[PDB]
Amino acid sequence: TLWPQREALKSALQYPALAGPVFDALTVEGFTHPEYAAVRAAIDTAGGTSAGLSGAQWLDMVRQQTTSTVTSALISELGVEAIQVDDDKLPRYIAGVLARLQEVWLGRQIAEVKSKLQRMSPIEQGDEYHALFGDLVAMEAYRRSLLEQASGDDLHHHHHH
Amino acid sequence: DDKLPRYIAGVLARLQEVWLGRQIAEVKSKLQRMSPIEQGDEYHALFGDLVAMEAYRRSLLEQASGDDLHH
């Protein structure tokens, strides 16, 4: 997910209102690339997209959360680097790159819950089984929905159908 | 490059910036022929180096200007 990690950061930095609560729900651990995780953390600390800041003010606020010259320069870089997609397609593009990341993370949680359920019986473990299976249904259903959403990222200028 | 007179250090920065601008164009062209959806990891990798080149080029432009006493 390295490409959508970079695009997700650019989206949060340039269009925090579009990036929105999904972005803010993305975990730092899901940013496998260490310099990207450090930018993700700085954005979280700066208040996330909900801080309702944008533009130069937002970028400064994020840079204020880091003492790394490398992280600081990367915030500036990702704050101005073009997201290469048509303006009308930007909201679905942003949702799409965030969905890529979420999907991957949900996959891990789904696998974990399934491994727990395989050790349990729906008869002997009654209510507990219902509770954990209900958790699985919620993620599996959402994962399926994201797989459809993740399609907004196909609108990238360098992707051709 | 401190053991060089400024005008020589400057021409070498100028040489580098000109060449790198052309290489940056080469790399951008390559990226235009690759999908970040079908080849996300390769595309990201190459894009990362494009961006590093661009940043170094900007720094060489500033060094050449400084060393060559541009106004």
DSSP string computed for A39-62: HHHHHHHTT-GGG---HHHHHHHH
Experimentally determined by:
X-ray
- The Cα-based distances of A157 to A78, A87, A94 in angstroms read 18, 11, 14
- The Cα-based distances of A145 to A20, A35, A103, A110, B59 in angstroms read 18, 30, 10, 14, 46
Measured in angstroms, the CA of B35 and the nearest CA of chain A are apart by: 5
Experimental structure resolution, Å: 1.6
Say if B38 is an interface residue toward chain A (CB within 8 Å): yes
A159 vs B contacts (CB less than 8 Å): 35-38
Which of B32, B35, B37, B41 to probe the A interface (max A CBs under 10 A)?
A: B37
**Among chain B residues, CA nearest to A73:** B55
Q: Is B41 within 8 Å of A158 when comparing Cβ atoms?
A: no
State the Cα–Cα distance between residues A10 and B38, nearest whole angstrom: 20
CB contact at 8 A, A41 and A75: no
Say if B41 is an interface residue toward chain A (CB within 8 Å): yes
Which residue segment(s) compose the domain that A7 sits in? 1-161
**Among chain A residues, CA nearest to B38:** A159
Say if B40 is an interface residue toward chain A (CB within 8 Å): yes
CB contact at 8 A, A75 and A44: no
Residue for token pair 């164009």: B25
**Dihedral sign from CA coordinates of A113, A116, A118, A122:** negative
* Token pair for B15: 């040489």
Map residue B27 onto helix, strand or coil. helix
Which residues of A fall below an 8 Å CB-CB distance to B?
Answer: 1-4, 6, 77, 81, 153-154, 156, 158-160
State the Cα–Cα distance between residues A60 and A49, nearest whole angstrom: 14
Closest CB from B31, B35, B44 relative to A160: B35
**Dihedral sign from CA coordinates of A105, A107, A110, A112:** negative
E strands, chain A, in order: none
**Per the structure, how many domains does chain A have?**
1
Chain breaks in chain B (C to N over 2.5 A) after: none
Output b/e per residue, B6-28; b: 16+ Cβ within 10 A.
Answer: eeebbebbbebbeebeeebeebe
Q: List the one residue out of A19, A16, A9, A23 whose CA is nearest residue A56.
A: A16
| B64-70: long-range pairs with CB below 8 Å, 24+ | B64/B10, B64/B11, B64/B13, B64/B14, B64/B17, B66/B10, B67/B6, B67/B7, B67/B9, B67/B10, B67/B13, B68/B6, B68/B7, B68/B10, B68/B11, B68/B14, B69/B6
State the Cα–Cα distance between residues A130 and A138, nearest whole angstrom: 12
CB contact at 8 A, A132 and A113: yes
Which residue segment(s) compose the domain that B47 sits in? 1-71
**Per the structure, how many domains does chain B have?**
1
- The Cα-based distances of B48 to A3, A6, A94, B10, B52 in angstroms read 10, 10, 20, 27, 6
Map residue A66 onto helix, strand or coil. coil
State the Cα–Cα distance between residues A38 and A44, nearest whole angstrom: 10
State the Cα–Cα distance between residues A6 and A12, nearest whole angstrom: 10
CA-atom Rg of chain A in angstroms: 18
Helix axis angle for B40-67 and B6-32, nearest 10°, is 160
DSSP state letter for A65? T
Closest CB from A3, A77, A81 relative to B36: A3
Q: Is A2 within 8 Å of B44 when comparing Cβ atoms?
A: yes
CB contact at 8 A, B27 and B53: yes
Which of A6, A70, A157 to probe the B interface (max B CBs under 10 A)?
A: A6
State the Cα–Cα distance between residues A93 and B36, nearest whole angstrom: 13
